Amino acid sequence: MQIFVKTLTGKTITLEVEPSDTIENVKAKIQDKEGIPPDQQRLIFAGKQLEDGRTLSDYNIQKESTLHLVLRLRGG
Amino acid sequence: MQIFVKTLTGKTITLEVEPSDTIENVKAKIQDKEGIPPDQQRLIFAGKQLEDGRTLSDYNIQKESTLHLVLRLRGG
Amino acid sequence: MVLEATVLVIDNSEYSRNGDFPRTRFEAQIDSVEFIFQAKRNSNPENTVGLISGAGANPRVLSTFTAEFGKILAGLHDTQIEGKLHMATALQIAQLTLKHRQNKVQHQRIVAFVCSPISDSRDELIRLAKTLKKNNVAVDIINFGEIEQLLDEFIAAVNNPQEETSHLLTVTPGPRLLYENIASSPII
Amino acid sequence: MVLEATVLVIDNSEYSRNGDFPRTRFEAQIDSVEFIFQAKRNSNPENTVGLISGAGANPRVLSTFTAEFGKILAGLHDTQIEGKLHMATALQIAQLTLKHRQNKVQHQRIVAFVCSPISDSRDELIRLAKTLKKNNVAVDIINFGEIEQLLDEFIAAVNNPQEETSHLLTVTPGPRLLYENIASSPII
């Protein structure tokens, strides 16, 4: 299974995942495509916000779904 | 003399001004082109910020110069 | 569907005029009010909806509860982009409006758009959230433009567990307009 | 031109990765450090420049004063996008660095990029500004990305009237890169 990540800059990168993958794993796959650590990652799909430890089966994420990546801002 | 105003949305509108016009006047000319009141206007040209009561001769603004309009945010 | 009085609060703050949500975040919000009204109205003929500018210099009631599309439209024209968003105040006047909704069999719901940085305290907002929950009001925030979620902790606070009535919509600039994303959301 | 030691502070905060300033605000800032260094260096062979990450979890000195392009480059590689911008702290370590600049005939100057919302108080920043002025340090802020000016009131405070050494550059996303806008600025 392959899925999509659209950053705010419109760049869509493709990832290879299978439906049981944790979001925390997806954020690591996203890290080695874009060089941004998971503690800086926030994932938005279907209007909701993807949570760590939940998996993509949980969110009914399926082939060619497009995830949105925005800045997870911590202490600001 | 005609000049240019580029909003953050890339829309460039053209205004007819003469070199002695106050900035506070330009912001009114900008108001009736774009429906945004001067107390909400901030003007950026040559890296500096255009001040009310100064005129365009003051800033050495000349024909086809491009002004940038950004939000003047007050109480936030 | 369900019989309810709902209050739409819009962010009319200086942030409302922006490219990212076509045509502008404000206008996005207008098409959204129109859609949402026409929706709630046809899920049950007895629904009635209200409108609240949530910014400016003091949140104000633009229209009381109606079935009338004309006075939603009259209240929608005659508001203005200006000021900053006063969230907790807006939420207070929304709650005050719902308490006095005619026909008390109507479930209470407020739907609010936030396209601004939230000036209010997290504490005031959480108190307010717990209060709202206690008074049996459900809340839907629409979160676009600057996306900061506080909002997650708010909806967390205000949600009624045994009937899950309170949703957060986080939406990013994109191909679809804002009202479409709202149509497909759990706010339906 | 003028003999001076200058310190470059960069905003390496999570805001640094952004589309609006190509390629990213961080990278904008790297090309800018390179340019600025190579510039100051050729206005006078005696100039020396330093580098400071101004974000992360605690502003840190990436390179001490040099004429050496290699260790500006070595210090520029080995920083990271992370954390929030701690402005007044960054300004403190910049000032501490300048006091101890070898060759005290060098006029003192700090040049700082702010692409983040400023978490610091206006009061701390104004105190800091008055202090800086008192210690005969000149300051150039580069203001891009989120443009909030506080910065105007800061540069107002810190500027030395009788020799006007302190400039604010407010720059908007556009056709030219950030380093070009900096080349044409009064920071030259």
Residue numbers in the entry:
A (entry chain U), B (entry chain U): 1 to 76
C (entry chain A), D (entry chain A): 1 to 149, 153 to 191
Please share excerpts from the published article on this structure.
Rpn10 is composed from an N-terminal vWA (Von Willebrand factor type A) domain that was shown to participate in proteasome binding, and a C-terminal Ubiquitin Interacting Motif (UIM) domain that binds Ub through Ub-I44 hydrophobic patch. Rpn10 is loosely associated with proteasomes, but the structural mechanism that releases this Ub-receptor from the proteasome was never elucidated. Large pools of a proteasome-free Rpn10 have been observed in the cytosols of several model organisms, and has been postulated that these shuttle ubiquitylated substrates or other Ub-shuttles, including Rad23, Dsk2 and Ddi1, to the proteasome1113.
The protein was crystalized and the structure determined to a resolution of 3.1 Å. The structure shows several non-covalent interactions near the isopeptide bond, which are mediated via a region in the vicinity of Ub-I36, a well-known patch previously shown to interact with other UBDs18. Inspection of the Ub-Rpn10 crystal lattice reveals non-covalent interactions between the vWA domain and the adjacent Ub-I44 hydrophobic patch from a symmetry related Ub-Rpn10 molecule. Superimposing our determined Ub-Rpn10 structure onto the Rpn10 from four cryo-EM models of the proteasome2425 revealed that the conjugated Ub clashes into Rpn9.
